[PDB]
Amino acid sequence: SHGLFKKLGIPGPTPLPFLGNILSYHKGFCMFDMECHKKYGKVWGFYDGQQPVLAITDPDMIKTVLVKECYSVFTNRRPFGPVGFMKSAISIAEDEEWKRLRSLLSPTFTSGKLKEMVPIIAQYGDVLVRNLRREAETGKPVTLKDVFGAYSMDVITSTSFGVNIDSLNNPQDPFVENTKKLLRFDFLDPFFLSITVFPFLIPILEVLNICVFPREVTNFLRKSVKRMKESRLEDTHRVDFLQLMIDSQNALSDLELVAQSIIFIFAGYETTSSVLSFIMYELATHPDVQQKLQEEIDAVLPNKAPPTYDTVLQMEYLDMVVNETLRLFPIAMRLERVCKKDVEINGMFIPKGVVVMIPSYALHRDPKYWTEPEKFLPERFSKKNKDNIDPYIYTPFGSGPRNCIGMRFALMNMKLALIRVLQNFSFKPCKETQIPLKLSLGGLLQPEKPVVLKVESR
Ligand code: HEM
Ligand SMILES: CC(C)(C)OC(=O)N[C@H](CSCCC(=O)NCc1cccnc1)Cc1c[nH]c2ccccc12
């Protein structure tokens, strides 16, 4: 097992028995990835316990796996942990099961569908400024994660389900409470450290019904969504996510409906608020850019005009800012696909069962692609420069048919928030503000201490 890469002629850190190369994650595993790049070059291998994982950095080879050969060989991600009824969630499903889920759910974010969500979010656009406005008065610092979290939440519930829960009215909300308690993925947390390293214990916990959210958060939402379904089940309106799954129960199912709902609620809450917090951090430690964006917004939307679908896409510099923030903090860290048969991609033999890994975080910081890769430089994404940029190196949303199904909704939502927040306020560091920011070594791409900034009226 541990002789695969030495035999296949592929370089790597020498694994230990049982552990594999586990102990190298103490640094945080984005750093591990970095080092390996710099040390081993353009392809390397390592072992998550007894699981061989082959990292790849070549743009062609990446394209092959993410795009050309997705259907035939590289179809699924690495088996998650114990997931019980969540095994049917789109992000976790495999093969035939996945293909249908993907085609059935993709019509949720289209040219028209997103368009229909603007006026709805717009209400929470309003409700956010009004939240901040009262802290803007007081003067003592603000945790963005929380204010953004509450926004994110409102926007996901109301769009997917057409259910206003007005979480911005509520630093006392059941939903954000249970939903945030959802993940325990810390690399250096006792739990998952034991699974990829005892992967044969997964089949066990499944029997026990012990989950990565043991019965609590899911029981909540189980009957929670059971609640939303029935109201709609009679009262006629809008054809939405909730609805599109009632359209296909005319070959979908009940626990199956609940599962995608959860995936969405998590994604829409956590991804969105986390990134939005990194963007505000940057705008504060880079005042020039904050002002320059505040100019773009004012010019396109004069007299603090309400943002819209088409005005949003008009904003070049906004987009540059978003893309640049994502270059630095590509929240997935790594893209992964399991090799489901013996294969040869661009000259290299890859054996069945191997996990092929793309280290987004590291490629986003590769000194051999990006001048001053540590520095936050939005201009590197201008129309002049936006085309020297390999879409198989810069991949914050993955690529190919298994890429981020939420991408377009993510961008609009985020931007829709930024616009409204920057046309009413400015943002500046204080002496809680960690300069420069530090990522936690724990498995998530998080700031180790929360992001806290000062908010002034305009
Ligand atoms: C800025 C926020 C976000 C980032 C950076 C992001 C990034 C990603 C990335 C990189 C992948 C995997 C791509 C690949 O492996 O090739 C992904 C998968 C996915 N994302 Fe997004 N995402 C974001 C927001 C969202 C939102 C708001 C939703 C809600 C709809 C969403 C739903 C999904 C689903 C369901 C998958 C698995 C796709 C599949 O297996 O078919 N994500 N996310
Ligand atoms: C645990 C559960 C079922 C609630 O969600 C997951 O599937 N877990 C993964 C890890 S969650 C943190 C990753 C992150 O910061 N956001 C990335 C993301 C999440 C959701 C949608 N779009 C982007 C979440 C996950 C689902 N599919 C993935 C593919 C690659 C990497 C992570 C994920």
- Quick one: three-class SS letters along 368-434? CCCCCCCCCCHHHHCCCCCCCCCCCCCCCCCCCCCCCCCHHHHHHHHHHHHHHHHCCEEEECCCCCC
Taking the C-alpha atoms of residue 275 and residue 325, their distance in angstroms, rounded to an integer, is 8
Strand blocks (E) in 4-98: 43-48, 51-56
Structure-token pair, residue 26: 């103490």
The answer to whether the beta carbons of residues 136 and 425 sit under 8 Å apart is yes
Q: Provide the terminal-to-terminal Cα distance of the chain, rounded to the nearest Å.
A: 62
The answer to whether the beta carbons of residues 240 and 217 sit under 8 Å apart is no
Q: What is the pairing mode between strands 51-56 and 355-358?
A: parallel
The answer to whether the beta carbons of residues 317 and 293 sit under 8 Å apart is yes
Distance 190 CA to ligand 2 centre (A): 20
Closest C-alpha to 72, from 350, 392, 332: 350
Q: Kindly state the DSSP code that residue 3 receives in the 8-state scheme.
A: T
Distance 31 CA to ligand 1 centre (A): 22
Chain breaks in the chain (C to N over 2.5 A) after: 236, 250
Structure-token pair, residue 376: 């936050």
Q: What approach was used to elucidate this structure? A: X-ray
Ligand 1 atom with the smallest distance to the CA of 336 is 15
Structure-token pair, residue 255: 């626990």
Closest C-alpha to 33, from 333, 443, 450: 333
Q: Kindly state the DSSP code that residue 71 receives in the 8-state scheme.
A: T
- Which of the listed residues 66, 80, 91 should we mutate to test ligand 2's pocket, taking the one with most ligand atoms within 8 A of CB? 91
The dihedral built from the CA positions of residue 408, 411, 417 and 420, taken in this order, carries a sign that is negative
Q: What share of the chain is helix, strand, coil (3-state, %, to 5)?
A: 50, 10, 40
Taking the C-alpha atoms of residue 448 and residue 439, their distance in angstroms, rounded to an integer, is 5
Taking the C-alpha atoms of residue 108 and residue 267, their distance in angstroms, rounded to an integer, is 15
Structure-token pair, residue 16: 């230990």
Backbone angles phi, psi at 258, to 5 degrees: -55, -40
Residue for token digits 């190919």? Answer: 400
Distance 403 CA to ligand 1 centre (A): 7
H helices of 106-212, where? 111-115, 118-138, 144-160, 174-180, 190-195, 202-208
133 membership: H or E segment, kind and range:
helix 118-138
Encoded amino acid at 3, one letter: G
Taking the C-alpha atoms of residue 357 and residue 404, their distance in angstroms, rounded to an integer, is 16
Q: Is cis: bond before 436, omega within 30 of 0? A: yes
Cite the annotated binding site for heme by residue number. 404
How many Cα atoms sit within 13 Å of 248 on the Cβ side?
A: 19
Backbone angles phi, psi at 396, to 5 degrees: -70, -5
Ligand 1 pocket (Cβ < 6 Å) reads 66, 90-91, 102, 263-264, 267-268, 271-272, 275, 331-332, 335, 396-399, 402-406, 409-410
3-class DSSP state of 456: strand
The CA-based angle 402-99-56, given to 5 degrees, is: 30
Structure-token pair, residue 305: 């005009």
Closest C-alpha to 317, from 347, 346, 290: 290
Resolution in A: 2.8
Q: Kindly state the DSSP code that residue 439 receives in the 8-state scheme.
A: B
The domain covering 1-458 belongs, at the CATH homologous superfamily level, to Cytochrome P450 (1.10.630.10)
- Report the 10 Å Cβ neighbour count for 189: 12
Strand blocks (E) in 169-289: none
Closest C-alpha to 397, from 327, 312, 306, 337: 327
- Which of the listed residues 98, 105, 404 should we mutate to test ligand 1's pocket, taking the one with most ligand atoms within 8 A of CB? 404
